[PDB]
């Protein structure tokens, strides 16, 4: 059986040693955080070094969802997905240089808090907090848990219930009461283990496929023997490899992930994921200085070039070695091998792991997959706790002390942990052969409005609370309309094409993301220009025009000397000359490397 | 990965040259206007 190879010996030893090390680092960092005050728990004390910030930025994004989805979908259509990671680096640079300086200069623990400070209404913050939490609980928790299930059932023998329970407990021991200091200090280990074990796997896979050139040639002839049987044969497009496989920039309409939608829509919802989304920014706001965030974000981008060569390429190698398993089309064979009737394309990475590498390497590598999942789940849980405590619980009790907010955050971590075990039945039982398509569709409907509202709350001065609210509501209504109309009719199978009309279903979800971005942008601008503006007195240091200004600010949400100095330092965003120069230069180098890679493959 | 007669790595070189020219042009424009 495929789930007994890891049973031998060194597999268990390596996984248990990994667990011991991660738990130990979590506990040590738990006693190095000054927990008990919000400044030290949710923001880690604003004392994090540069490189742990970068490590956490990588490991919070990269989860089991990435490994499973990238490898499997790479077995479907080539390098198409890799560019997600690559767009990440450009936008992380953008984040580090533009968005974090304002948020630090605004003293905003949460992004909805920044929006309240700039706009001056409770409903904006409440709506954004609730929507962001729903996006968390659905998209990211689903990605992590589903991919956990896939690589667990294929590689291990553990039932989803026990496995997800144990992973949640291991996480909970340090995330529930660890805050960002514990998160990042345990996350740096996740990142290091991931990079090491995954470099070993990619090297082994490329050696066994015979190198990159032979990899290219062999991949294009990985056509499954069986294309017949059952009710009917299949149209020579559900199994054959794609001719545009090795190009990132594919046809604008004919191909999956067309280049216009690719670059534009991907940037649009990546501004949500990195610059506006709560999970990633907390990592940047927990810094010791303003140069440490730039160091972290450059490192994150530099080793965000790696993902493709470690997830997309192995998936292809998984297809080439085991084409019959990772390229089945016949419903009988597909239902036979792993599970879902249509699919079996999602098991490319875990089959490559459980088969390619030797015993000890298989153990360490399976623990890499676990390392992926734990980091993302820790990140989302802590960020959801921060959002809840800072907006919803804060507005349900205006006289709450710090201890009450801390206990509220911890209880929210507990409840949101329980939501994941409540989620495992849906993810297991539902027909999830197209799960990642749905996850990206969900993120492509509710993201662009929030990206627009924040890009206008920063790079603009006239927007106001009516405009932001009603643009967000309109964008939500459009996204929900399309989402319901696409889920009710359901996304089309290869043998049985789509049911639903071409206006809704014909448009690729990235194209609809950009369209919704444009509509929300226009609506926010129009409604804002109809209502009286917010004077500049209330917007010092909250818009890109006024960040340098040092006049007194009338907040829209409205020792002593030592406390004032500490506050000013926490809002201080100035670095030394030489360090600033080095950080600008290395950021430019990172973006250059990305442009070179984009041009090299695409 | 071949477009036209272009080698895969020559795209990297050309794209880097264009991007560096754009960075230098943007820096010069920023300096002149700020
Ligand atoms: C939202 S932005 C944000 O995402 C981050 C992110 C978030 C979630 C996942 C799971 C990943 C990996 C992935 C898997 C799987 C897929 C494709 C799945 C659907 C699909 O392939 N559909 C076809 C075949 C094209 C179709 O059209 N039919 C993409 C990315 C990446 C990324 O790490 C960030 O850097 C970026 O900023």
Author numbering:
A (entry chain A): 18 to 575, 621 to 664
B (entry chain B): 22 to 55
Task: Show passages lifted from the paper.
Here, we present the cryo-EM structure of the hSGLT1-MAP17 hetero-dimeric complex in the presence of the high-affinity inhibitor LX2761. We obtained a map with an averaged resolution of 3.20 Å. Therefore, the structure of the hSGLT1-MAP17 in complex with LX2761 represents the outward-open conformation. LX2761 locks the transporter in an outward-open conformation by wedging inside the substrate-binding site and the extracellular vestibule of hSGLT1. The glucose ring of LX2761 binds at the sugar substrate site of hSGLT1 and the aglycon group extends into the extracellular vestibule. In detail, at the sugar ring of LX2761, the C2-OH binds to N78 on M1, E102 on M2, and K321 on M7; C3-OH binds to the side chain of W291 on M6, and main-chain carbonyl group of F101 on M2; C4-OH interacts with side chains of T287 and W291 on M6; the methylsulfanyl group at the C5 position makes hydrophobic interactions with T460 on M11, L286, and M283 on M6. The distal amino group of amide bond on the tail interacts with D454 on M10 and its adjacent carbonyl group interacts with H525 on top of M12. MAP17 binds at the peripheral and interacts with M13 of hSGLT1. hSGLT1 shares all of the eukaryotic SGLT-specific features observed in the hSGLT2-MAP17 structure, including the extracellular shelter stabilized by three disulfide-bonds and structures packed by intracellular loops. We calculated the radius of the putative water pathway in the current SGLT1outward-open structure, showing the pathway is blocked by the intracellular gate on one side and also blocked by LX2761 on the other side. The overall structural alignment shows that half of hSGLT1, including M1, M2, M6, M7, M11, M12, and M13 are relatively stable, and we name these helices as the constant module.
